[PDB]
Amino acid sequence: SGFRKMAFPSGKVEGCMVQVTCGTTTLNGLWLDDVVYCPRHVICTSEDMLNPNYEDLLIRKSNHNFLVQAGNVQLRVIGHSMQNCVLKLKVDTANPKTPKYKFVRIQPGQTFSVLACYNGSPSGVYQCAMRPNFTIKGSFLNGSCGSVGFNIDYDCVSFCYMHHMELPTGVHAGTDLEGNFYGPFVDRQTAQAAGTDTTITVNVLAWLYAAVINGDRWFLNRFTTTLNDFNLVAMKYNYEPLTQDHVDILGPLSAQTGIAVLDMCASLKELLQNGMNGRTILGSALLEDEFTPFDVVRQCSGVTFQ
Amino acid sequence: SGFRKMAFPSGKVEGCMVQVTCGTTTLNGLWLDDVVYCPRHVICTSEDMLNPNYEDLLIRKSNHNFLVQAGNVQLRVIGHSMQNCVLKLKVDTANPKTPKYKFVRIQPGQTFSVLACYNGSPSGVYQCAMRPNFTIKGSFLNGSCGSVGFNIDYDCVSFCYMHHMELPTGVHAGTDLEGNFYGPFVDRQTAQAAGTDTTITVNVLAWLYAAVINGDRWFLNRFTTTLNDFNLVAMKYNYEPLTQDHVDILGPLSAQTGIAVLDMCASLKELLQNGMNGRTILGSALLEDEFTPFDVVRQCSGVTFQ
């Protein structure tokens, strides 16, 4: 028992990290088969970032302008193309540690692990949620761009995030591995701000089911609610609306505990309107929204009585 | 910026995990050079657990009675001895992925990463503290015994913890890699209870320095305090006493931020007495004590590992 924010083991990802330098710019790349992926701003300078013309800048670059290092050994670059905001560097060597992998685009509220890297080398691993405003609350310093987020499903690594930039409130923005930004952000030095961040309700409900399972039920009530009513109250408290997909995903936790999703929604509606009277749930003073229902199910491993 | 509960990259440790089966008992082992380390209770059954005579049980086992599996490959066991509560299995093969490593015994309030494993397979990584009562607040299910805790410094993995058992309050007990329990606990089913757990004061101060470095400085007051003043307030809130050694250890963070230790202590004394008035620190409603001063420096410097 016990409940912890937990990341995926980072080893299959550590086997793909490389350093990529262009001119005086260095950041991290991801080496899969004979390709290296990195943020396209590696070809820029600080001065270019004010109004960058990526097509033109890449035109004036040869393969020889990209120095790719996998620890000690240099990788020869044979080709370079841009896909949206990611550079793809074709190399003469296939990564012998390439895991089974896929590129996925994740949805707001879905979690993933981040391997923070500097100069092609891992610094640390932590669990993140894609916020409703298409930011993540990371821990990243200069040199971290090209750090990736990922899930492991079976033995298959699903890469879902590449780090590009930090916004003025200290949250981070990036792309999927096809180089499309999450959210309304661009890889240019211009006034950007993250939108109003909302709370990931399906994750708050997952966490409430976790509370119940680890013994805390002080907040439960006999009342039940309908879904549109809940959503109208949710809206008022900067909570994301709960969709039918979300109700479906909470099915296993509902079944294990015998507490219907709409029952738990009624408990949450109450907690939002009244506050929590300085009482801790699973040792937290605030409702946690970065635990998915799948995260709670894995750690709790409960049975369902039918 | 950003500040996250961050684990060490787990890859060096994932290459050492194996499955150890003895009769019908299966749990995890650690394969370094030609030795496999695991909890000695692998040689027990549910029968033996009440009050097991480990010496007698081990005498009645040959090398042939131990099946060690490293993915698909079976390892030949060539020797076996017991050191305190760990079994050591000599195998015919040195682990070719053995990292630079050492065995250390940590002190209460020191942090480390746990690689949670099931049947020799890594499932999760998370950051933990050794509590003042020599328990850890883990996330472990049946099958997790022999999961290890570790730090990385330089290119060197320091193994500090092996998981043995869960106490009736849902907290976890185990051993260093020489098989000596942390705390007053034994590897038998006996009435055993964790002592009074306190907060790790020096770690809360480290965390306040992290907040400041990241721009969350609302809690800083102009008040200074004596060490004894601070302690006499702190004691009341189930906080460890702060020692001169603790003040010394916070020197680097004090120097980097240009804020005196005893100033920060005065800010903490204020937070303890008055609460946070709704404000959060680094997104958190509660004071966090699972970051050491070295943890804050590593994360804020972007320290990497081989």
Query: Residues near B119 by Cβ (< 8 Å), separated by ≥ 6?
Result: B19, B26, B28, B143
* Separation CA A264–CA A261 (nearest Å): 5
A153 to chain B: nearest residue by CA?
B123
- Here the tokens at position A59 are 């035109």
Question: Residue A91: beta bridge partners?
Answer: A77
The Cα of B15 is separated from the nearest Cα of chain A by a number of Å equal to: 8
B141 to chain A: nearest residue by CA?
A1
SS3 string, chain A, reads CCCCCCECCCHHHHCCEEEEEECCEEEEEEEECCEEEEEHHHHCCCCHHHCCCHHHHHHCCCHHHEEEEECCEEECEEEEEEECCEEEEEECCCCCCCCCEEECCCCCCCEEEEEEEECCEEEEEEEEECCCCCCECCCCCCCCCCCEEEEEECCEEEEEEEEEEECCCCCEEEECCCCCECCCCCCCCCCCCCCCCCECHHHHHHHHHHHHHCCCCCCCCCCCCCHHHHHHHHHHCCECCCCHHHHHHCHHHHHHHCCCHHHHHHHHHHHHHHCCCCCCECCECCCCCCCCHHHHHHHHCCCCCC
Residue with tokens 């010394």: B248
The residues of B annotated as belonging to the active site are 41, 145
The Cα of A144 is separated from the nearest Cα of chain B by a number of Å equal to: 9
A145 is catalytic: yes
In CATH, what number is assigned to the domain containing residue A241? 1.10.1840.10
| CA angle B208–B212–B215, rounded 5-degree value | 140
Asked if B15 lies within 8 A of A11 by C-beta distance, the reply is yes
| Contact in structure between B85 and B177 (CB atoms under 8 Å) | no
Closest of A108, A54, A101, A85 to residue A162, by C-alpha: A85
Instruction: Considering only the beta carbons, identify the residue of B4, B5, B304 that sits closest to A122.
Output: B304
Kind and range of the H or E element at B209? helix B201-214
Which chain A residues contact residue B215 at CB under 8 A? 170
- Here the tokens at position B26 are 């299966």
* SS3 state of residue B230: helix
Question: Residue B248: beta bridge partners?
Answer: none
Which chain A residues contact residue B3 at CB under 8 A? 139
Asked if B11 lies within 8 A of A9 by C-beta distance, the reply is yes
CA-to-CA dists, residue B244 to A263, A278, B210, B260, angstroms: 53, 34, 21, 14
| Burial (CB count within 10 angstroms: exposed 0-12, middle 13-18, buried 19+), residue B1 | middle
- Here the tokens at position B196 are 């009074």
* Separation CA B292–CA B298 (nearest Å): 10
Please report the resolution in angstroms.
Answer: 2.0
Instruction: Considering only the beta carbons, identify the residue of B6, B9, B306 that sits closest to A139.
Output: B6
- A109 φψ region: left (φ > 0), alpha (ψ -120 to 50), beta (else): left
Identity of the residue numbered B128: C
| Contact in structure between B250 and B293 (CB atoms under 8 Å) | yes
The Cα of A166 is separated from the nearest Cα of chain B by a number of Å equal to: 8
Instruction: Considering only the beta carbons, identify the residue of A14, A298, A301 that sits closest to B11.
Output: A14
What values do phi and psi take at B115, rounded to 5? -95, 100
Which chain B residues contact residue A5 at CB under 8 A? 5, 126
- Catalytic one of A38, A41, A85, A160: A41
Which chain B residues contact residue A139 at CB under 8 A? 1-4, 6, 299
| Contact in structure between B187 and B85 (CB atoms under 8 Å) | yes
| Contact in structure between A270 and A198 (CB atoms under 8 Å) | no
The dihedral over CA atoms of B239, B107, B180, B122, expressed in degrees to the nearest 10, equals 100
- Here the tokens at position A293 are 């229902």
Asked if B8 lies within 8 A of A124 by C-beta distance, the reply is yes
Closest of B6, B12, B14 to residue B298, by C-alpha: B6
For A158, other C-beta atoms within 10 Å of its C-beta total 18
Asked if B11 lies within 8 A of A122 by C-beta distance, the reply is yes
What values do phi and psi take at B96, rounded to 5? -70, -15
| Contact in structure between A182 and A173 (CB atoms under 8 Å) | yes
B143 to chain A: nearest residue by CA?
A1
The Cα of B251 is separated from the nearest Cα of chain A by a number of Å equal to: 23
Best mutation site among B125, B142, B217 for testing chain A: the one with the most A CBs within 10 Å? B125
| Contact in structure between B115 and B127 (CB atoms under 8 Å) | no
- Here the tokens at position B4 are 């996250």
In CATH, what number is assigned to the domain containing residue B74? 2.40.10.10
The Cα of A139 is separated from the nearest Cα of chain B by a number of Å equal to: 4
* Separation CA A37–CA A17 (nearest Å): 10
Alpha-helical regions (H) of B215-260 = 227-234, 244-249, 251-257
Cβ-count burial A5-16 (b if 16+ within 10 Å, e if not) = bbbbbbbbbbbb
CA-to-CA dists, residue A271 to A230, A287, A289, B208, angstroms: 12, 10, 15, 30
Technique used by the depositors = X-ray
Q: Which domain does B230 fall in, by range?
A: 201-301
Kind and range of the H or E element at B297? helix B293-301
A80 is catalytic: no
Asked if B124 lies within 8 A of A6 by C-beta distance, the reply is yes
